[PDB]
Design a protein around this nucleic acid. Sequence first.
RNA 1: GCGGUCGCCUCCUAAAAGGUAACGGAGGCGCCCAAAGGUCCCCUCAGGCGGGACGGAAAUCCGCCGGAGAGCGCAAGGGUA
RNA 2: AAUCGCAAAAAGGUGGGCCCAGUUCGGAUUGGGGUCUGCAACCCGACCCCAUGAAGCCGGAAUCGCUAGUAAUCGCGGAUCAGC
RNA 3: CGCGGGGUGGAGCAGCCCGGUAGCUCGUCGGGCUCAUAACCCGAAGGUCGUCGGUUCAAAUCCGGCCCCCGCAACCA
Lengths: 66, 83, 181, 116, 25
Amino acid sequence: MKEGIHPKLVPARIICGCGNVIETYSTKPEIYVEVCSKCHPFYTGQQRFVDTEGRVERFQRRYGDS
Amino acid sequence: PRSLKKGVFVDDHLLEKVLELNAKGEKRLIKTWSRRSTIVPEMVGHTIAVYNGKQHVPVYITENMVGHKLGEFAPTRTYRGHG
Amino acid sequence: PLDVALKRKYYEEVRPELIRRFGYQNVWEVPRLEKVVINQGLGEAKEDARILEKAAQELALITGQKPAVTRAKKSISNFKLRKGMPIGLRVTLRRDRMWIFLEKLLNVALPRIRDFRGLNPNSFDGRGNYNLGLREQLIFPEITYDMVDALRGMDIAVVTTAETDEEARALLELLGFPFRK
Amino acid sequence: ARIAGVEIPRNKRVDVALTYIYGIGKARAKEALEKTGINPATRVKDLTEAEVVRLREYVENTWKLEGELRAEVAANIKRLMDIGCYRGLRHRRGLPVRGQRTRTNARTRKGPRKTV
Amino acid sequence: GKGDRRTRRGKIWRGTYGKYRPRKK
RNA sequence: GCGGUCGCCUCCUAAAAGGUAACGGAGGCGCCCAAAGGUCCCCUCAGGCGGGACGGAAAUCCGCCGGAGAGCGCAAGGGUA
RNA sequence: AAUCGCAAAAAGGUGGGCCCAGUUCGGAUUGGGGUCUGCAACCCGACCCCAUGAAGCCGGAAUCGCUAGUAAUCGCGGAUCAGC
RNA sequence: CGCGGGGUGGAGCAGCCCGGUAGCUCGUCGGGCUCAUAACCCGAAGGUCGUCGGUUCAAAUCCGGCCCCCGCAACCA
Ligand SMILES: [Mg+2]
Ligand SMILES: [Mg+2]
Ligand SMILES: [Mg+2]
Ligand SMILES: [Mg+2]
Ligand SMILES: [Mg+2]
Ligand SMILES: [Mg+2]
Ligand SMILES: [Mg+2]
Ligand SMILES: [Mg+2]
Ligand SMILES: [Mg+2]
Ligand SMILES: [Mg+2]
Ligand SMILES: [Mg+2]
Ligand SMILES: [Mg+2]
Ligand SMILES: [Mg+2]
Ligand SMILES: [Mg+2]
Ligand SMILES: [Mg+2]
Ligand SMILES: [Mg+2]
Ligand SMILES: [Mg+2]
Ligand SMILES: [Mg+2]
Ligand SMILES: [Mg+2]
Ligand SMILES: [Mg+2]
Ligand SMILES: [Mg+2]
Ligand SMILES: [Mg+2]
Ligand SMILES: [Mg+2]
Ligand SMILES: [Mg+2]
Ligand SMILES: [Mg+2]
Ligand SMILES: [Mg+2]
Ligand SMILES: [Mg+2]
Ligand SMILES: [Mg+2]
Ligand SMILES: [Mg+2]
């Protein structure tokens, strides 16, 4: 790369719903990310939290017995 | 929203004819005047003819019309825009 | 820095599982990553360069490279635009510096997308390369939310040595790319 | 600090800064406060990073919000329309769904006047 | 305001009672 | 007479050298550029398909295909990667 | 039924919070979950709760009311009435 | 078929030189004043620029063909 006119890019830290991401290698070492969904939080590790599909089923059971 | 439950009110004359169509297992056009009543899950698949005040409108039935009433599928409007 | 977790994961994980899956006779035949091109379509900066440098400021902060400023090939009235004028920002990152970038893209950025149930499994351009469009520059860890003045996304073009995208798919998958199946 | 999906509130207070989330009102907010054992009177401007994470996980996991909620709403409407439901074909015509008189004052749901 | 059923003054206006205006003298 | 024309460039007429007429068929010039000049070094188009937030037929980007149909300040011709 | 009940009067008063923010202003619309009346709440009831939070930052030309316990502003009751 | 000027909201006119945005009066529609209409006052809608092609990044505008309009000319014979 050309000299000057550049960001430093240095080994860094990171935080999330997980714990730590040592990899990084970026400017501004040590970062606090809202939620790294890579550690296992969110969608991956298919939580499917707040599960759904009430719709028919819901009005079905409060109906079969009302 | 809306409610009424702890009763789930449905008229007879059709409920009897709907049940009498499950046993023997026969699906055919069934005319009614009762839009005051809820629907299925024992009617699911029957072509009930709901009344709109003018004439009976044939209404297909699927397991997602369940929670609602019969009149909700037989409009009393006839609008077709303005001008 | 020649370590990098993903660069490691490619050789000692992805590369082998790819061979026993396609049966490459040679060593090179197996798909290598090369060249990741990031391009901001920025008509937003028609008659104001002041807004074009703040973006470059941002792009180099997330990539580690100062981007090059593309310019309008032809004049095209309808939406202003004459033969000159800075109309875009683009940086081509290759080996290593591409690796450290692609790693944070998977383990931080995409995770921070409002919604997101997977990347499009049809953005493969047939000859085995993948493109994806982001809608804002806040999903990258380097961004502080207090450095922004307005939201501007970008185009990301990942290119692979794999002749087919049937294969190009596996590479990206095994690398840890979240596809919507 | 970022909570549901994203949505960064700030200052003012804590029981109000939660309302600014899609899916959270006076109740759902003023509730999670003494359920994660935190003082509302303080401002999100200042609070231990610990308190911050009790919120996000509590709220973002207790129920669905922002994107997820919105997605479910528009999804219920699609069904109402799909089925031929009157309550549903009042969504096609973009007209008031809950009774009401459209002969006049229906603006909010009908839009600005198109005089003739 | 007298139109926010989700408050004291609102509940009074309509004349009803509830969570935001409980019956308790 | 009235009308039109009057010098210069391009094409055809022009009969495979040059040249060649008519109030024959059609266009253009009366400028322009301190870089649109000299040299050295690099670079190669137009399009077509696929791919990609706001990008739409077309703004910027990636992929393959693309001998020139692009470009060369303005007419036409010849020329030219 | 002056001898019980509707019944809390409301503004006010005290204390505290909001700090000018389309905002703890404003509650329209809409999704969801229920209560009650009624044979029956789809068209078409009211009410509660959760979420949604709209237009509105003071209204062009015009125009109404009121001379005192009036005008403003605050609540309460009744008739009709299953409910509204 | 000579020469010159034109063709633009419903009417009549600008805008065309010089490129890049279509303006005026009337009328039309909605509201006001009036017992009522008009006058009057407050608001709003409405034109692809005769036509086909060309030029340019861009055409009511520059260029060409065609169709209509107005004016002038048609003399010695
Ligand atoms: Mg009987
Ligand atoms: Mg109503
Ligand atoms: Mg008041
Ligand atoms: Mg309020
Ligand atoms: Mg003469
Ligand atoms: Mg010759
Ligand atoms: Mg091309
Ligand atoms: Mg393309
Ligand atoms: Mg395309
Ligand atoms: Mg050429
Ligand atoms: Mg030429
Ligand atoms: Mg030539
Ligand atoms: Mg040539
Ligand atoms: Mg009472
Ligand atoms: Mg507003
Ligand atoms: Mg509010
Ligand atoms: Mg204010
Ligand atoms: Mg008097
Ligand atoms: Mg009253
Ligand atoms: Mg009553
Ligand atoms: Mg004229
Ligand atoms: Mg005219
Ligand atoms: Mg003129
Ligand atoms: Mg007028
Ligand atoms: Mg009028
Ligand atoms: Mg013409
Ligand atoms: Mg040119
Ligand atoms: Mg034209
Ligand atoms: Mg004479």
